[PDB]
Every structure is written in C-alpha cells, then in structure tokens.
Amino acid sequence: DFLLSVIGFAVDLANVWRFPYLCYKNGGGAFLVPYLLFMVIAGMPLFYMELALGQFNREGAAGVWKICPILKGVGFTVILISLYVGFFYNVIIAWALHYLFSSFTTELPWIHCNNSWNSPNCSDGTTPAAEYFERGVLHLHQSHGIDDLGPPRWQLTACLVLVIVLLYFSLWKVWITATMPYVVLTALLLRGVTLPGAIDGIRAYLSVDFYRLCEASVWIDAATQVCFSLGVGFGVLIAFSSYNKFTNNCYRDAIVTTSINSLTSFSSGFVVFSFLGYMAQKHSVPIGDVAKDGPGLIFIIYPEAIATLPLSSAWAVVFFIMLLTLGIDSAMGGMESVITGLIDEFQLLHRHRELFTLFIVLATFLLSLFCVTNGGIYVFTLLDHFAAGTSILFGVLIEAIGVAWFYGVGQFSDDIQQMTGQRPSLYWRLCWKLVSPCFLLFVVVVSIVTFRPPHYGAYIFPDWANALGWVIATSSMAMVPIYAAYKFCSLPGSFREKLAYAIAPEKDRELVDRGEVRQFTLRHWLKV
Ligand SMILES: NCCc1ccc(O)c(O)c1
Ligand SMILES: [Cl-]
Ligand code: NA
Ligand code: NA
C-alpha cells in the first residue's frame, strides 16, 4: 500500500518526543494555538503541493526542477538537510534501545538512590530517574562543556552499531509499524486518564495565557515543529510520489496524513500532561516545578510515573518498543531519500550503489559518534537547534515561491486536472500563491533577527559554538545562489537570452526560440 508508507514516515519521534517538550516549555495552551493556526494555514497546502509535484514530473527530489532550471539548488538543500538531521536522529533510537535492554528485569534500575551512579543530592533534591538518566546512561557529570567531550562510551556505541547495521542491510538494494504504536498509545492514554491527579494536568494543558503569544518565539517554534513533523522540506515526499501511479488521489492522502499527524501529537501531549499532573499530586510540588526543561522529558517522566504502577516492567517494555518502531521507519526514509537523490542526479555511480550506500552509512556512523561521548548532549542540543532551524523554512519557502510564481498556479492546476478529474479550488490556489509564502518569509526574517542561543540547564554555550552552528545552517541554505550563478554563467548568449532560458521551463523551448516568453509579461505574475 502507498498510504501505509506515507503514514509510517510522517508519524515519527517528533510526535512523541518533541511535541510534549515544546508544550511544556511554552505552557499548556500558548503553544496549541500557533501550532494549529500554522498547520491549517501552511502545512496541509505544502503537503499537497509536494505530493502533486512529485507525482507529476516523476524525476526525484532534484529532477522535478525542469519547470524552473535556475532554482535547482533547493534540490540539494533538502538532501543536505536530511543528511544533517540523520547525524543526531539515530542517537535517540540508540537511547531507546539501551533503555529497552536495561528494562528486562524485576528491579528497574531507576527506582532508588542506593546505586553507584547516585550523588548525596538525591531526593529519594534530585529525583532518582533524572539522576539515573544523567549519570548512569549519559555520564554527563564527567564533562565540563562542549570543549571537553571525552572518549566515546562503549555501551551506547553497541546500540549505535546495531541501528546502523539494521539500516544498511535494509537499504542496500511498515505493516508492523501500522498498528502497534497506536495500540500502545491508546493503552497508555487509558491508563493515564484514570490515575488520580491527572485532571489538574489536563486543565493546565487546555489553558492558554495571552502574554506568551505576543513574543516572537512560540510562532517560530510552532512553524519549525510543523515543518519538522510533517516531513516537508526533506525531499522524501517528492521521491515517494515519483514511484506512484499516475491516476492517484494525492488530495485524500494529504488530508488523511495531516489529520493523523495532528491527532497523534494531541494524544501524546495529553498523555504527558496527565502523567505530569499525577506525579505533581503524588509529590508536593507545582506542575511547573516537576522536571527541568530539555530533551529528556520523555526519558525522565515516563519511567518515573511508570515505576509506581503494578507490572511496571511490561509498561516499560511496550513503551520502548513503541519508541523504537515509531522512529526506525523515518530514519530509514531519510537516508533512502539522500541516497536515491544523489544517485539519480549523477549517473556515474549508478551501478556502484553498494559502495555508495556503504560510504554514506559509514559517514553517518562516524559523524554521529560525536554524540555518544561524555559531553555528547551538548552536541545533540546544538545539532537539534541548528540542523532544521531556519534552513528548512528557507527551503520550503523557496520551493513554494518557485512552484507558484515562476511556473504558474494556473499551470499547476491544469497539470493536476490532467493527472486527475478535478481542478483545485480557490482556497488552495490562494494559499499557495499568497498565504504560505508571506507567513514563511515573516517567520524566516524574525528567526534571523532574534537569535536566542541554545542552552542546556544552566550551561551557556561559547561564541565559537554559535559560529559553528550558523556555519552548519548556512552550508545548506547557500546551495541556491551558487547554483543560480553557475547556471546563469553556463548558458550562452546575451543577458536577455540567458534569463529567458534560465527562468522558462524546459518544455517551452520552441516557444522561447520563436521569441515569446510567458514569464516576461505581467499577466503571468498577476494571475491567481
Ligand atoms: N521527521 C524527520 C525524519 C527524518 C528526516 C531526515 C533524516 O535524515 C532522518 O534520519 C529522519
Ligand atoms: Cl507534531
Ligand atoms: Na515513523
Ligand atoms: Na511527524
């Protein structure tokens, strides 16, 4: 089935690991409003556009730009973004595998403070779960900062090797993941709702304060989260649709995938806040002082409020199995996109697919070895801030501007009506033409203007770390102007001739040679 592949990749660890984190950081309802607004405004139109554009041209993440030859660097931008994201996406899978391996006993290791990895400041005041996660799994206490990393730990490197071997051996030439995560999530939700004290947690979840909406950070977080979770801006949807039947309904597929993604995120947040409220009632603390903010919320809160219920081992086992299955598919899809795009762009290493895949896998493993050191959480934070960031928004904005303005939203609608029996309505055309590009441009400009450098707890990153992060972002962002300059210089003729052959699709060549260019008039740009 084609739908099960799109659903499997779209729903990932971002629905269950990042959404509750950003909800707890920005309060209950101050994050749900911009998220839903940006979702309806841009996420669904971009998903539909990506599916249709991939299905029609049938060339891949970079070969679809025969409709605009000069804007072809955005095809390499998405490949670079996927490669960067893969450098830290697999470490979470390694952590989940480690927890699953260590959660097969009658005495869970995060129960009390009578172990060798504890400190005299254990609550049982720091809770034993956070102390375990930070001193027996990560060994964070043996590092001073990002300038003192230390050698890699051999315990997490084995899990990294296992994940890498699985990926390579499944990518050298879905049905299980279709149902199990949803069953586990529903069981967890049913268990969490009935726990005493969860009503206050859901009350905090469904309450919005109108002072955080006036700051230009919740909107950036919501836009970035929507783009990251949906999967737009990686080049995966284009490649997926390039292999699909011509007479296929991408409208229905986009609607269903978006609805499922939103429902999954909402359920994950509801469960997390119910557990937080239960823990807060169990102890004597406010909800906002239960755990510190960071990308360890689901590794600290879940074991803590799972170790109190009867049959905790089974709950832990199913939780970590669901975590593994929900992420292996997306980790596979990203590398599939990178490899297939790079092998279809350059038809010299085509039959040499085995060696190219081996090289890509080796590079991913070697460069992800940086996050398994003693101070690897700082590298993880830096990558999580600077890999998708404003680069993904810039790429999405460039793709939308290309497809709409430089090609014709009317021409796009005519192509869709040829591929199907219907013409997209005025809502979709208006969104694509005006609504998504304007909001994306505003968000990109605001994100550049306001920096807010990353941090972990009470640790402040130095200057060179921020410089390196900005270099990482600019490396993927700067693929468009370089290829534009190369393409303009490579073409022969005069400036007018070069522009005519650079901004026109590679199908109106006879019309251009006759001297008639549609892009050189005003009705082309004033058409909605
Ligand atoms: N939801 C993001 C899924 C994703 C995207 C790119 C990657 O390289 C990867 O490993 C995972
Ligand atoms: Cl999400
Ligand atoms: Na997935
Ligand atoms: Na997702």
UniProtKB/Swiss-Prot annotation:
CDD domains per UniProt: SLC6sbd_DAT1 (cd11514)
Taxonomic superkingdom: Eukaryota
Description of activity control: Inhibited by cocaine, which occupies the same binding site as dopamine. Inhibited by zinc ions. Enhanced by the antibiotic valinomycin. Inhibited by benztropine. Inhibited by GBR 12909 dihydrochloride and amphetamine. Inhibited by mazindol, GBR 12783 dihydrochloride, nomifensine, diclofensine, amfonelic acid, Lu 19005, Win-35428, bupropion and ritalin.
Residues bound to chloride: Q225, S229, S265
Ranges of the Cytoplasmic topological domain: 408-424, 492-528
Effect of Y302F: Reduces dopamine uptake
Listed Pfam families: SNF (PF00209)
Major place of residence: membrane
Compartment list: Cell membrane; Cell projection, Neuron projection; Cell projection, Axon
Any GO molecular function: norepinephrine:sodium symporter activity
Segments on the Extracellular side according to the record's topology features: 105-152, 196-214, 285-308, 451-461
Cellular component per GO, a single term: postsynaptic membrane
Signal sequence range: none
TM spans (from-to): 1-28, 29-60, 61-104, 153-172, 173-195, 215-243, 244-284, 309-350, 351-374, 375-407, 425-450, 462-491
Residues the record lists as binding Na(+) 1: G8, V11, D12, L326, D329, S330
Keywords on record: Cell membrane, Cell projection, Disease variant, Disulfide bond, Dystonia, Glycoprotein, Membrane, Metal-binding, Neurodegeneration, Neurotransmitter transport, Parkinsonism, Sodium, Symport, Transmembrane, Transmembrane helix, Transport
Record's bilayer topology term: Multi-pass membrane protein
Subunit: Monomer. Homooligomer; disulfide-linked. Interacts with PRKCABP and TGFB1I1. Interacts (via N-terminus) with SYNGR3 (via N-terminus). Interacts with SLC18A2. Interacts with TOR1A (ATP-bound); TOR1A regulates SLC6A3 subcellular location. Interacts with alpha-synuclein/SNCA. Interacts with SEPTIN4.
Name of the protein described by the UniProt record: Sodium-dependent dopamine transporter
